[PDB]
Motif scaffolding. Structure first.
Motif, short mmCIF file in Angstrom:
data_model
loop_
_atom_site.label_atom_id
_atom_site.label_comp_id
_atom_site.label_asym_id
_atom_site.label_seq_id
_atom_site.Cartn_x
_atom_site.Cartn_y
_atom_site.Cartn_z
N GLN A 32 6.59 35.13 20.66
CA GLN A 32 6.02 35.65 19.61
C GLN A 32 5.06 34.65 18.70
O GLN A 32 5.29 33.47 19.14
CB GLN A 32 7.04 36.28 18.56
CG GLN A 32 7.51 37.70 19.03
CD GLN A 32 8.51 38.41 18.24
OE1 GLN A 32 9.28 37.48 17.75
NE2 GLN A 32 8.83 39.62 18.69
N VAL A 66 8.34 45.35 24.81
CA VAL A 66 8.97 46.41 23.86
C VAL A 66 9.14 45.83 22.69
O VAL A 66 9.11 44.42 22.49
CB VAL A 66 10.17 46.94 24.33
CG1 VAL A 66 10.00 47.87 25.80
CG2 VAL A 66 11.21 46.27 24.63
N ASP A 67 9.45 46.57 21.41
CA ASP A 67 9.74 45.69 20.29
C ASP A 67 10.30 46.89 19.41
O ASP A 67 9.84 47.99 19.38
CB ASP A 67 8.62 45.41 19.54
CG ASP A 67 8.94 44.30 18.29
OD1 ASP A 67 10.13 44.03 18.21
OD2 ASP A 67 8.11 43.77 17.74
N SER A 111 4.77 40.33 17.68
CA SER A 111 5.02 40.47 19.22
C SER A 111 4.04 40.81 19.87
O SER A 111 2.96 41.35 19.40
CB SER A 111 6.37 41.29 19.33
OG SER A 111 5.84 42.65 18.78
N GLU A 167 14.02 41.87 22.42
CA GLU A 167 13.57 40.64 22.73
C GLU A 167 13.94 39.87 24.00
O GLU A 167 13.30 39.20 24.69
CB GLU A 167 13.70 39.73 21.65
CG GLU A 167 13.04 40.20 20.32
CD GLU A 167 13.44 39.26 19.03
OE1 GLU A 167 13.85 38.26 19.12
OE2 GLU A 167 12.96 39.76 17.94
N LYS A 196 16.99 45.24 18.49
CA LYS A 196 15.56 44.55 18.46
C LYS A 196 15.81 43.27 19.21
O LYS A 196 15.04 42.80 19.93
CB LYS A 196 15.17 44.28 16.88
CG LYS A 196 13.93 43.33 16.74
CD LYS A 196 13.40 43.22 15.36
CE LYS A 196 12.17 42.60 15.39
NZ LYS A 196 11.13 43.63 15.69
N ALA A 234 4.11 43.69 21.88
CA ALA A 234 4.05 44.96 21.59
C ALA A 234 3.30 45.48 20.36
O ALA A 234 2.43 46.55 20.51
CB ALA A 234 5.47 45.67 21.72
N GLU A 235 3.50 44.80 19.37
CA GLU A 235 2.85 45.04 18.02
C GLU A 235 1.28 44.70 18.09
O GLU A 235 0.47 45.41 17.60
CB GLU A 235 3.34 44.08 16.93
CG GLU A 235 4.85 44.43 16.50
CD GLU A 235 5.38 43.44 15.32
OE1 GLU A 235 5.15 42.28 15.63
OE2 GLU A 235 5.97 44.10 14.69
#
Ligand code: ATP
Ligand code: ADP
Ligand code: CA
Ligand code: CA
Ligand code: ZN
Lengths: 497, 71
Positions: free
Chosen positions: B58, A131-132, B24, A120, A116, B26-27
């Motif tokens: 974020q 991405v995440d 984030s 980041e 993760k 992506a989220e």
């Protein structure tokens, strides 16, 4: 201070309020509540936080993989103040089918959180698609028999896609560029110390990743080390995201390069388009052999085994030899030799010894069944590789160079028999550790007669015959030691006339 | 005021898909696509940027509150 999207957030909040629970028909709220302790991890600080949670878990799995089975779960939030089970979120709780050590779960959590962090870091370079990696934690059910541990993560709605594996698999059907570019970025940005692969999930929400590290000691049994890295780069065709971030391509052989270039037309028809805000790639390293030899030279401390890229190429060589890249087909020896050459140029002592033996038309261990064509250039190259390996500490190469300077065996045509140099290499071999008395007696003979630059030295000849006699002892060779003592007396007798 | 705060925490959990405490890009993309909202990827990244006061890429809960409790 100004926010021009508040209504977008609020419209989404309202859409979610009237959204149906995808797991409503599984009736998890009717399951007797169980008590658990949740361990969550912070990878920047390396610290664990634990709390008490309440869970309602399905009694039977909804899916099983190779290593773990998955259970649908609902859990009450400790961020909210008084959440009811009607609004609890959905979670996937995974358990190892075969019993494993308790530390395996915490190590998997550390793996996922490190991946993760790398996601980041990739996002910080402004990629076309960010991405995440989903956070994964541990829940301990201390009231069940055995106090079992479960991995816990949030349930991701959508099409679960495996983009790549940890063993060279690549999803070419409707190819995407972000996963592969992310993996290559992790390889380069970590300075070749790790690579994040096994990219899978919904869109760009990833879960269950794998990390291959240089040492291969951490992150569980999926860490295939540099071999895993090789498995990636045997199949990775760099796309435009790789190039927009300055990632150098991996040096593949012509066969492999064409096999991975066959999908360049599909790579050009991909939907992920670049904007131009993509920045260039803790100390990053390039994936090319030329830039890596430039860096290794820039070290200046003349060295061997200082490049992970060379170890990756050596892993490719061994995979070719073992039949990992060929089907039920003769394995590609030319590409194996290609990667062996690259490993040797990057300071892998095994590769240097192997190529010295192969170019000298000698028997060898790595790529044993490969015999290279014999040329004068190859003889010079073989002797040069053997000399480099001898100066790098290899005893077999030291003995071979000593014999080359002694008898001429395997000596490059550009060189000449030099008994002082042969004595130097014989002694370098003897001070490291075929038997000792054989080489000592050879030095004694050479000093008894002299020649090829070395002057006759009866005193040292007798001394070395004495050393060889003492070495024939300590090896249960009595008669040999007696002959060596006799030869020492003979050598000394010349000084009295 | 109390249930508004609880509502804001509920709203934060809608977008913090993995529950690590940070929304984030992506989220947000995943949540917007799942809810049928029609926003482009550029608009999603701009939403994150607008609410990102600290600059970590974020949106934490504090910045989410700042954005929701606004003039
Ligand atoms: N968060 C999630 N949301 C939805 N589906 C999920 C989620 N996590 C896992 N799954 C599904 O569960 C399946 C099996 O679990 P998963 O592969 O992560 O674990 P595993 O058994 O350790 O895997 P492996 O066999 O690769 O070692 C996945 O292939 C995926 O289809
Ligand atoms: N690894 C972690 N360490 C510490 N606090 C965390 C961690 N992950 C999340 N949090 C905090 O916990 C909050 C979410 O708690 P909760 O809703 O109980 O978790 P979940 O959503 O995983 O069920 C986040 O908003 C954040 O403040
Ligand atoms: Ca999050
Ligand atoms: Ca922030
Ligand atoms: Zn690439």
């Amino acid at each position: 201070n100004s926010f021009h999207f508040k209504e977008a957030w609020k419209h989404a909040i309202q859409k979610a309020k009237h959204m149906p629970d995808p797991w409503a028909e599984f009736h998890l709220e009717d399951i007797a509540t169980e008590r658990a302790t949740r361990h969550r991890y912070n990878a920047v600080t390396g610290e664990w936080l634990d709390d008490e949670v309440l869970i309602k878990m399905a009694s039977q799995p909804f899916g099983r993989g190779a290593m773990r089975e998955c259970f649908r779960t609902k859990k009450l939030s400790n961020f909210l103040h008084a959440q009811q089970w009607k609004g609890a979120s959905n979670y996937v709780a995974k358990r190892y089918i075969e019993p494993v050590d308790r530390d395996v779960y915490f190590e998997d959590v550390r793996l996922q959180m490190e991946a993760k962090l790398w996601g980041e870091e990739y996002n910080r370079h402004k990629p076309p698609k960010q991405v995440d990696i989903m956070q994964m934690c541990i829940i301990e059910l201390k009231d069940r028999p055995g106090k079992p541990l479960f991995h816990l993560e949030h349930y991701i709605e959508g099409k679960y896609i495996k983009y790549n594996s940890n063993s060279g698999f690549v999803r070419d059907d409707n190819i995407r560029l972000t996963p592969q570019a992310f993996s290559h970025f992790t390889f380069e940005r970590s300075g070749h110390q790790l690579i994040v692969v096994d990219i899978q999930g919904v869109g760009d929400l990833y879960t269950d990743p794998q990390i291959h590290t240089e040492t291969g000691t951490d992150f569980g049994d999926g860490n295939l080390g540099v071999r895993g890295m090789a498995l990636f780069f045997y199949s990775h065709a760099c796309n435009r995201i790789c190039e927009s971030m300055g990632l150098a391509p991996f040096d593949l052989s012509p066969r492999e390069r064409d096999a991975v270039n066959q999908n360049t037309k599909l790579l050009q028809s991909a939907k992920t388009i670049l904007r131009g805000t993509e920045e260039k790639c803790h100390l990053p390293r390039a994936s090319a052999v030329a830039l890596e030899v430039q860096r290794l030279n820039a070290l200046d401390l003349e060295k061997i085994g200082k490049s992970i890229l060379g170890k990756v190429h050596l892993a490719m060589v061994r995979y070719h030899e073992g039949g990992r890249f060929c089907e039920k087909e003769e394995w590609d020896q030319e590409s194996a030799v290609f990667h062996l050459e690259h490993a040797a140029n990057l300071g892998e002592l095994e590769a240097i010894v192997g190529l010295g033996l192969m170019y000298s038309q000698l028997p060898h261990h790595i790529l044993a069944d490969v015999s290279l064509k014999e040329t004068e250039e190859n003889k010079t190259k073989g002797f040069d590789y053997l000399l480099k390996a001898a100066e790098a500490g290899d005893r077999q190469s030291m003995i071979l160079v000593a014999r080359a300077f002694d008898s001429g065996q395997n000596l490059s045509p550009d060189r000449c028999q030099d008994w002082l140099e042969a004595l130097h290499w014989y002694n370098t071999a003897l001070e490291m550790t075929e038997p000792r008395y054989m080489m000592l007696a050879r030095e004694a003979e050479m000093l008894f007669t002299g020649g090829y630059g070395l002057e006759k030295d009866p005193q040292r000849s007798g001394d070395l015959y004495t050393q060889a006699a003492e070495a024939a002892m300590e090896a249960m060779k009595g008669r040999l030691a007696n002959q060596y003592y006799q030869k020492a007396e003979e050598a000394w007798a010349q000084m009295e006339e | 005021d109390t249930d508004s705060e609880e509502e804001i925490r509920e709203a934060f959990r809608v977008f913090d898909k993995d529950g690590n405490g940070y929304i984030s890009a992506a989220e947000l993309r995943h949540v917007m696509t799942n809810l049928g909202e029609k926003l482009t990827d550029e608009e999603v990244d701009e939403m994150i940027r607008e609410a990102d006061i600290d600059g970590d890429g974020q949106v934490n809960y504090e910045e989410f509150v700042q954005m929701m409790t606004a003039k």
